[PDB]
């Protein structure tokens with residue numbers, strides 16, 4: 001029922017999901033001059049060498065690549081986190097044109113897209129339990145700007161024509177998510193929420209300072225996707241981003257000076 005349009009978009013979500021007006025909603029604008037360098041923050045540990053991708057799916061709001069999360073194979077640790085978080089899926093948010101598409105903003109700047117790698121805390125045993133806890137999820141967010149192609153994204157781009165419409169899926173084995181990461185793991189962090197319904201307040205956000213560059217041809221393929229199902233009136237899957245929400249009583253911390 002929910003979506004990104006005039007009649008079902010972000011301004012409507014609070015009716016079915018009242019937490020939309022909560023105290024720790026995401027995304028937010030990252031004011032770089034107000035974010036506090038925290039020398040107690042540890043380097044982020046990204047251990048993706050044994051990742052096992054399974055499927056790629058158009059879920060009617062984005063496309064996602066899903067992973068086997070039944071053992072510690074692709075895990076996030078360190079940084080602001082206590083314990084171990086397993087990679088479940090990644091997906092993207094993007095715009096109709098290159099000047100919008102990201103969910104987080106940096107000094108009000110919008111990037112062309114944003115990659116979210118979604119992880120859950122192993123101490124809660126499964127993701128459905130983790131989303132009920134304030135420290136249940138860790139989402140690693142990476143900005144995309146348009147420039148040179150990202151080689152590690154091409155395998156994704158080349159299969160999008162097979163999942164054009166909603167609920168369509170394909171095999172997507174042997175994909176290495178290390179190929180989506182920028183050089184630096186410098187980050188901002190704050191406590192927040194899912195940016196899509198149910199908007200649960202369960203996420204430690206880790207947003208990388210360094211964007212990745214993707215080519216115009218790569219992002220053009222994202223924009224050929226459809227929100228609609230097969231045979232239904234065609235509506236391009238574009239502008240699938242929630243705008244920045246009030247920071248309220250939260251501090252954004254920087255891992256770098």
Ligand SMILES: [N]S(=O)(=O)[C][C][C][C]C123[B@]45[B@]67[B@@]89[C@@]1%10B81%11B698B746B814B562B%10%1143
Nearest residue numbers: 116118127131139193194195196198
């Ligand atoms: N854009 S974002 O990265 O904030 C969304 C993170 C939600 C991921 C989820 B997957 B499916 B639906 C939602 B519920 B259930 B599992 B549970 B985890 B959260």
Ligand SMILES: [Zn+2]
Nearest residue numbers: 091093116195
């Ligand atoms: Zn997301």
